[PDB]
């Protein structure tokens, strides 16, 4: 598989803790940072909101979840993100079947609980709610990871 490198990055980063004492599975930004670390992809610093500002400035914005899954299927690193008033959220888009023919499959940790967490079996549409999943932004890095 072409997107396999990224799947592995996600799997491994699952049990790590990018910030000490905070398990990645409980911290979205941490899990993303770990994935970017393993893949050697430059990643902006700080919490979720900050990371979204970073990607907004320095990364390519894709048009849709579907296009995002295209990039992600090509072995690119694709981050879906949206800011909150305080706690934002970010997730790693992976290749696969779109949910409701719209929302792509993701990996993310979440402080909201096990419910917000995705080991690849949920898409951004099952993580963000009905209103937020339509407001998502998708960022891709200019260079493939495979």
């Amino acid at each position: 598989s072409l997107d396999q490198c990224i799947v592995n990055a996600c799997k491994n980063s699952w049990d790590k803790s990018y910030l000490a004492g905070t398990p990645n599975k409980d911290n979205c930004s941490g899990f993303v940072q770990s994935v970017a670390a393993e893949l050697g992809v430059p990643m902006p610093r700080g919490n979720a909101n900050a990371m979204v500002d970073g990607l907004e400035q320095s990364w390519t914005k894709l048009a849709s979840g579907a296009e995002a899954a295209q990039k992600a299927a090509q072995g690119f690193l694709v981050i879906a993100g949206l800011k909150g008033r305080t706690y934002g959220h970010v997730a790693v888009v992976i290749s696969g079947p779109l949910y409701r023919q719209k929302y792509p499959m993701c990996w993310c940790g979440s402080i909201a609980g096990a419910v917000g967490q995705s080991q690849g079996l949920k898409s951004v549409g099952q993580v963000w709610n009905r209103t937020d999943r339509d407001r998502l932004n998708y960022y891709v890095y200019s260079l493939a990871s495979c």
Partner: protein, 148 residues
């Protein structure tokens, strides 16, 4: 009777892909639209069905979520349904009128571990695990604003 009791949400036999639960007062139901999970932990797609057993009437909660399957609670008098809803890393606790299905109260809990029991609501920060009791900071918040 401002006490809240967790309401287990389970598969309903005869109603394909429905999950729900009930007590003497209220019935609550979700539809599971996840293609690959017959044992989902949450419900992204509305509506949520609320049956008032007293009145015989029922109503729908048409938008919201994502609703946590482990997160539904009934008030003692049956007049309120308290639900945990989350999006991304954010989360909140929302109290609906069981007769009207109207939002009565809403509280942003993002970042905090949480629990609901006989005593009231507990939120906590700086935690080792999802147990609120792993939290180096624990606040007891009153559920009164969700009631009445």
């Amino acid at each position: 009777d401002c006490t809240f009791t967790q309401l287990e949400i389970v598969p309903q036999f005869g109603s394909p892909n429905m999950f729900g639960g009930e007590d003497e007062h209220v019935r609550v139901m979700f539809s599971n639209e996840d293609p690959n999970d017959d044992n989902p932990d949450a419900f992204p797609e509305p509506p949520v069905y609320l049956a008032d057993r007293d009145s015989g009437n029922d109503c729908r909660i048409e938008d919201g979520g994502i609703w946590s399957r482990g997160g539904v609670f009934l008030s003692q008098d049956g007049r309120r349904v308290l639900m945990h809803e989350f999006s991304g890393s954010s989360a909140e606790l929302v109290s609906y009128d069981s007769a009207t299905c109207k939002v009565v109260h809403r509280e942003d809990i993002s970042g905090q571990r949480w629990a609901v029991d006989k005593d009231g609501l507990r939120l906590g920060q700086k935690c080792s695990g999802e147990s609120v009791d792993s939290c180096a900071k624990i606040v007891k918040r009153s559920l009164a604003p969700f009631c009445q």
